[model samples]
Target: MVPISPIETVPVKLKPGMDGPKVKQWPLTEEKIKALVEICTEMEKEGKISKIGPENPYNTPVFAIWRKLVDFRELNKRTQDFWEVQLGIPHPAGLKKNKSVTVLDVGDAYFSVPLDEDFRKYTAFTIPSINNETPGIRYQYNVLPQGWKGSPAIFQSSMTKILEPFAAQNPDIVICQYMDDLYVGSDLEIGQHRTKIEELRQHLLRWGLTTPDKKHQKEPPFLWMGYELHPDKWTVQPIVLPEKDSWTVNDIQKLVGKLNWASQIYPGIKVRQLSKLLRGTKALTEVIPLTEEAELELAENREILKEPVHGVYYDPSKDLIAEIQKQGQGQWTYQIYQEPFKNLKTGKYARMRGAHTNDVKQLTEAVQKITTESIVIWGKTPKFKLPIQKETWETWWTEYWQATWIPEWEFVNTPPLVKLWYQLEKEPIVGAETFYVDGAANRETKLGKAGYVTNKGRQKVVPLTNTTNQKTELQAIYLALQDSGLEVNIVTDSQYALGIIQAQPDKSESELVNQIIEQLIKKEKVYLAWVPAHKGIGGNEQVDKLV
Candidate 1:
């Protein structure tokens, strides 16, 4: 038989009024060891215990000492492997978001014994003193024992079988586990929450498990795992520690792990440099000196955690938008809009735009104007022609007489075009393009023309009537693509076209913009560059003259 350390040095002594059946004790003595040996021998004689060798199908060796205990079970490596595979699946969605949530922590979860026989071999131990006096002295346990290597796997397996049915029947109630901690969440009211929790409690009680009342939390902000989860936010917040200069390697490693998890939610928090600093260091006691940059970043991470909570709840039917306005010099204001397109078949549309300025108030006021009013007219629409294939023209001619062809009547304004033109001029793409395109509108005549110049000396001009300058600019790019059979780059002085290409807000140019994308996607290479207008560029001048 295998030898083990004594369970206890002294035999348990029960005082007056003590309940002997409820109380059990382990004492290191010859008499106790002889009693255990006698019990195992008797069980074997009754055919209740079988004699198995040290080797099993799992390839895990059960020592000869444990074999004498009879009916000893080796570690189930297959079950452990299976448990790990199941754990990799995604967590229950209800736990991450809901109106009302509760987290229940099991108290002494592992201590509970479900079956006396299953855990009997695990509690078996041998005392050296008893073994020396009487060679066969050994004891087997009647309850589950902690510190066993396979204890966690066995406990989880048993619990999953018991809890799976409960979770399945109650769709509203979610039961999930991370090790021994049980998390139960529901959309039910506070009173109903208590009822569900009690139901779960009673269910666990029948299986010899218990959930502590003190650790149950119904409301957030609750601390679950490493994340501090709240009710309304789009992202989970991280717990920030107080700023300090002195940190050991252990501290850095632990903090880095936490930051890595937080980064999944808050991508803006930079951890690359911090991670690099701690790499290749092995000593836990070694002090890691923080640089000025590191110090600043640490403070910034804390500030982000302390920021106001503005969470977006998930809804399939409604549109959601989030705006963050920061205060300080050189601050930027950003706006994001998400909604289904007017055509139900077209699907949803999402766009984000940001502008940098020292005057935060100016940007804030502009955002407020858009939010308060259903629509804020940036400017008037410009003129441009829609692209049509040669086949389309033939179809039109076949249906009607060519002599009766009438030009589509349209009037174009310049204010909106001018506004977009100004923005493009202010923030231009750095690189030049192989093809330069521009469109100019003469407000007095309400006429416009789109033109483009290529590096290979190809020039194209298309006349337009009753179209805005914005549309004309987009048409210029379209015309350039139509002529350039080979892959090419395009430069434009139109911010409106740039916004459409970048999936930003430009309602009028969307149809034509999509056409341009379709053509460009077919080619091997295509680039859209924005350049300032009225900058004396030759191509811009030629297009202006054409207008």
Candidate 2:
């Protein structure tokens, strides 16, 4: 016989109409009401064009809890009052200052009931009697009382009811709850947080309930419920076992569910640990890694593949280029065939195709030679292998080419900028000096314009303007940057021009500019900067006329 565990008390003060349907709560403020109305109008407009159904195209299994409880409202009220008295917290309109509170609705724990050994010996007679027939015999239709089914909803309601008064009495107190996990704090400050927690603990005890230890507690990322109480991260408290021993499958399931819930709070939890404990459960057991190579092969065969090898695919419409190698273009065709086969047939052999040529001995020798040297699909090794390795001349040149800037020329740079530069340079990177030079398109007369040539002393009269004074100013900047033998920054008066460059407009000129920028940046040659025009800055005014 399974020993009876302690009777769990759901902490709530419920009333008769608690199980009844609830109308949506109206906004307490006019601003909120206006926002609500606007939201509703927007939703109505969206509903006209959208279809409603499960999110996934394929049938995706989802589990939910929807249950009602009664007689907990008064209980919760008394519980709250008891805590208020014990904590010496005053009424809403009283003189006492409200301390920060963390109300933790530590959910109700679970226990399992199992049939006696004799009943298990004769399995049909073990289940409890329900309605007219024995539950064991009527298992096909009849249902047994399950802990997980209504537990979440029940505890959720209870916590809500218990905190109702706290919300009303202490409007200044911050209340946050994610399902049964509740947190109340005035602010994220530590002293006040501890005060709230103690008050919540007192309230729980007064209500004939106790908060579960940190092990069973579920803490969430950022705001618990709605209040941003903690930094976004994962944490897990050491789990402690209940005193009573013998556990049923249901008990194990509860344990697994609790652990899963905890895993959400503390990410990177060792899933293997829980797997070892509840390996018997069908849902969890399915996650077991494949042992048989044939099974793995079958799975690989039946995998569905995206057609067209590119563009948007899957949920959220991620770019195919970002997802698949070669945007799925060069995917092996054999994989497609293999995936479908594995999915359809469980533990079954796949049909094979073969051919025979006229020169039997010669063909056999050729087949052996090809199979040994090149790839041959003999249900053994992978099918494809390239004969030659491709060389990346572009990368090689960019990486190993001689540096133009001498050590004496380089200046001490910012650490973050240098780090950013280092990261950017891992690929091709560029840095541009702040300046611009304008180019004049010469159609009729071909006069070679000099770019920043040394003239009198240290000053040089570069090609300031060409044929016409149109803003080929930007074009020259691009050209000057490319020709500087050093990376050059292009300056422009037009914000629209900067936007075009930033957005990388899709045109021949824009594309050329983008390519230059990519090479310059990738090769660690240039960086962009925006300087206000008409400013008395010498570099700006000089670059402006030069453009």
Candidate 3:
């Protein structure tokens, strides 16, 4: 059985009036208490009521006076529903491109609506006891009142029911409304705007709802929902007020809530410093004074709020091949192209080069340097021209590199080699035994060889089958580690193996490196050094000839 509270008390502020007592007593009948219990029970069944002992952000007392009097719970489901619809509907900034934009504001929204008597008991509260009375008297509200828990939800639901059908009937015009605030827009002319306005007015008139003329707007650059709307760029900017000298925790919470809503429309606006204060307070369960950094953040965000940010519109008819070409040449030159083409995704661009190149080493270093400073904006896919194959072009732009090319004059430009290399000069090497190693593979036979030379004139050669130069190099390093149980240093001419071990490995070589890592973990320490191939170093020459 649900509990019902017959009376709740509240103090009345002193007023200059000839009254019998300083406090007033209002009454709640037994019938009203029964209705409240029934309503609360129904709300509980619908999962509208919060569970017992739920944590509240405000840290205020809940149900102190109504301990067993009434099990009343505020219905917040409609408020959440309103926000869901509000967020899904785009801002009217997009409508500014249309020549005619009309803004409407509904006045005296909540008070204008009549409250049904059947639900009036649920909006009941009590006045303070007068003359040391045993219990305070309660009174029910006939009209939806301000500060009532369910007043906004009821008003919003009522308004939505009236406006939704009108919005659907007029597809040519754009309509946005939140509570009493309404904005209508049309691309046609002022007449079209007026027609839509009349359509809305007639609907409201049928329901006996009237809007004030003073709050209605017929001019351009109208302010709505704390945003300044203009037609020139169709941009939306947030309106920021000065910060207060003294603020409570509740004020900070309200400020953050507003900032969060604004961030949905204005990208790149952040409240990182303010968020830190919230985190610290939540962790310690106490209010912390605002810091200089938070003040600075608020000031910076205020400036950012003034900057107009426009929404992006994509056109399917336009081709982005040229843009991709420009981006590939300017920003991402080699790192993207050298890998398998199908593996490339959107926001990634690439440049192609011929396999044969005179300055291969120089090109490798150049590509590596550019990769560190490149910026990649997501969802930008580039279309490619054919004989490159239309079937894969879809997959390439939608779906998708490397050096090898012919220097033909008729071909417009020589195909350049896409080389990528980085020098790991500061990478630490572990172990006492150091060996210079190299690996070679015969392309025709698919056979491979691993060779190494120690500092003490020790030479070793191991034969390998069915492997590429890259795998053979990794195999050489693996064999050296297994041969010496202690720490080892491998100086090699294989950038492929060096890069995989020193940094994040490519998808293809990840398995091979993982196996190498298992063996490397057992040793005291392991380090890799890269050296130029065909150099005049004795250790490099000895290993080069054996391979």
* Candidate 2, 296-376: lDDT as tens digits: 332332231111111111111211100000101111111101222121001111112222111112222322333332122
In model 3, where do residues sit more than 4 Å from their true spots? 1-96, 107-109, 112-119, 129-137, 142-154, 215-227, 236-547
Candidate 1: tens digits of C-alpha lDDT, residues 1-547: 4332221111122233432121122343556555555655675564333444322111211122323322223322111222341434331111235555556666465545333353344333343335465432334433333433345655676677678878888998777765676777667888998898899888777654557767554456654444455675434444565555688887777776665555434424544445657878878798888877667767776765565333233333444342323222222222322332211000011122233211212332433433432121111111112122334334433432223331231222321111111111223323433778888777767688888877777777778888788888888888877777545678888988775655422222257765665566455556667778878776555445354
Candidate 1 local distance difference test against the native: 0.49
Give Cα-based local distance difference scores for all models: 0.49, 0.32, 0.49
- Ranking of all predicted structures according to TM-score, beginning with the best and ending with the worst: 3, 1, 2
Candidate 1, poorest ten consecutive residues by summed lDDT: 341-350
**Residue lDDT tens for model 3, 1-547:** 4333211112112123322111222344455544545554554464334223212111111122322232223322111222232334444422325556666666454555555544443444442333435443344444445554455656676677777788788888777666667777667778767877877877776665666656454466555565555564333445465467765666677677666656534433445556667764643334568889788768766875776554332223443331111222212221111122211211222223422221232232333333322212223333222112233223222311234221111111223322222122245554366788878888878788887877767777888788888878887777776776456677888888775665422123246565566566567666677788877766774345345
- TM-score of each model, in listed order: 0.39, 0.22, 0.39
TM-score attained by model 3: 0.39
